[PDB]
UniProtKB/Swiss-Prot annotation:
Positions bearing Phosphotyrosine: Y173
The species this protein was found in: Homo sapiens
Known cofactor(s): Mg(2+)
Gene label: MAPK1
Subunit field text: Binds both upstream activators and downstream substrates in multimolecular complexes. This interaction inhibits its tyrosine-kinase activity. Interacts with ADAM15, ARHGEF2, ARRB2, DAPK1 (via death domain), HSF4, IER3, IPO7, NISCH, SGK1, and isoform 1 of NEK2. Interacts (via phosphorylated form) with TPR (via C-terminal region and phosphorylated form); the interaction requires dimerization of MAPK1/ERK2 and increases following EGF stimulation. Interacts with MAP2K1. Interacts with DUSP6.
Domain remarks in the Swiss-Prot or TrEMBL record: The TXY motif contains the threonine and tyrosine residues whose phosphorylation activates the MAP kinases.
Top-level taxon: Eukaryota
Short sequence motif named Cytoplasmic retention motif, residue ranges: 304-308
Regulation of activity: Phosphorylated by MAP2K1/MEK1 and MAP2K2/MEK2 on Thr-171 and Tyr-173 in response to external stimuli like insulin or NGF. Both phosphorylations are required for activity. This phosphorylation causes dramatic conformational changes, which enable full activation and interaction of MAPK1/ERK2 with its substrates. Phosphorylation on Ser-19 by SGK1 results in its activation by enhancing its interaction with MAP2K1/MEK1 and MAP2K2/MEK2. Dephosphorylated and inactivated by DUSP1, DUSP3, DUSP6 and DUSP9. Inactivated by pyrimidylpyrrole inhibitors.
Protein name according to UniProt: Mitogen-activated protein kinase 1
Amino acid sequence: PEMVRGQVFDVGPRYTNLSYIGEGAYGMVCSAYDNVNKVRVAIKKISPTYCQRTLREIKILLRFRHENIIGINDIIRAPTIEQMKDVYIVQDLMETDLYKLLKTQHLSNDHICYFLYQILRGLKYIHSANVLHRDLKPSNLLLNTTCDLKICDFGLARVADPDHDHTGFLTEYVATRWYRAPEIMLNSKGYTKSIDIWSVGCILAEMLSNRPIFPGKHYLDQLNHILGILGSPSQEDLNCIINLKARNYLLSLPHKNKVPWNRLFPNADSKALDLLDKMLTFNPHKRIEVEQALAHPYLEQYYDPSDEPIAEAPFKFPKEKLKELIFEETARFQP
Ligand SMILES: *CCC(=O)N1CC(O)=Nc2ccccc21
Ligand SMILES: C=CC(=O)N1CC(=O)Nc2ccccc21
C-alpha cells in the first residue's frame, strides 16, 4: 500500500500517485489519479467503532443527485465485515473551498452573486428532500477551477422536524458556532429549514468582507455578536419566544442599536444587502425561505426555477449494527 505523511492510504491499484490535500473532519484527504476514468479525484480516509455521521452522510449523498452537491464516485473497503477497517470515499477533485478562497482572495460582486446562487440552488434540492444540512459554512462549499460550487459534509444533516424543534434555553448544539442561528441559543434544536438559511446569510456576509460576521468565542457570546449587529429584538419577536428563561435573558440585556448593513458593507451591492437582511432575520418564522431567496432581485441574472431541480421524493432514515449498515450501504461499489 502507498503511504502519505507517514500514514497508510490504501486505495490502489485503481487510484495511484497520491498527494495530500488536507485534513478533513474524519481523517486524511488526498488526491489520486483514477486509472479508470483518467482524471484526478479526491479521496477521504475514514478509520474506526464507527461514527453514525459516516453512515448518515453516505446514505444521503448516495441518494442525492445534483450539480451543486458533491457526489460519491466510489467507496473502497474490504470485501467482508470481518476484514473491513478503513473506508475510503472517492469524490470529484475540487481545486479549493470557500474557506481557503476567502483567506486570500477578494471576491468580485459577480463571484459573490454566482456563488450565492449555487449555494441556494443546491440548498433548494436538499430542502425539497425534507433534509437540513445543518453545518453550512465556507469550508463545506467546494469550488473547482471555473468556480462551480458543490456543497459537502452531510454528517450533521437531519430530516426536518419542525413539530419537535423546541427546547430550553442554552441547549448544547453540535454545528459550527459562527454560523448558528440566534434561536439555537434560545429555544431551537435546529430541526427547521430556517437554520440553514441563517448559515447562508452568514456565508454571504463573509463573502462581502472576507471576515466572519459573528465570530463568537463561546456558546452565549455567539448570540451577543448577533444582537450586536441586528440590535435588540422587537416586542413582537420576543412574544414569539414562549420559553421564559430565553425571553428573560433577552429582556435582561441593555438596548442595542441595529448596525446598518450598508455601514458594515460599504462596498456591497444594495440588492445583496436587501437579501442579506432577509436571510439574517432574527425571527425564524419571518426569515426568507430558499425559493424566495432564489427569486430575489439580486439573483435575477441566474434565477430559473425550471433549471433549479428538486428531489424526486422526501428522504427518510449499537456499534456492530452500525458497522453492518455501513458495509451494506457501500456494497454497490464492490466488484
Ligand atoms: C466537505 C469537505 C470535502 O468533502 N472535501 C473534499 C474535497 O474535494 N476537498 C476537501 C479538502 C479538505 C477537506 C475536505 C475536503
Ligand atoms: C406562555 C405560553 C403562551 O403564552 N402561549 C400563547 C398562547 O396564546 N397559547 C399558547 C399555546 C401553546 C403554547 C404557548 C402558548
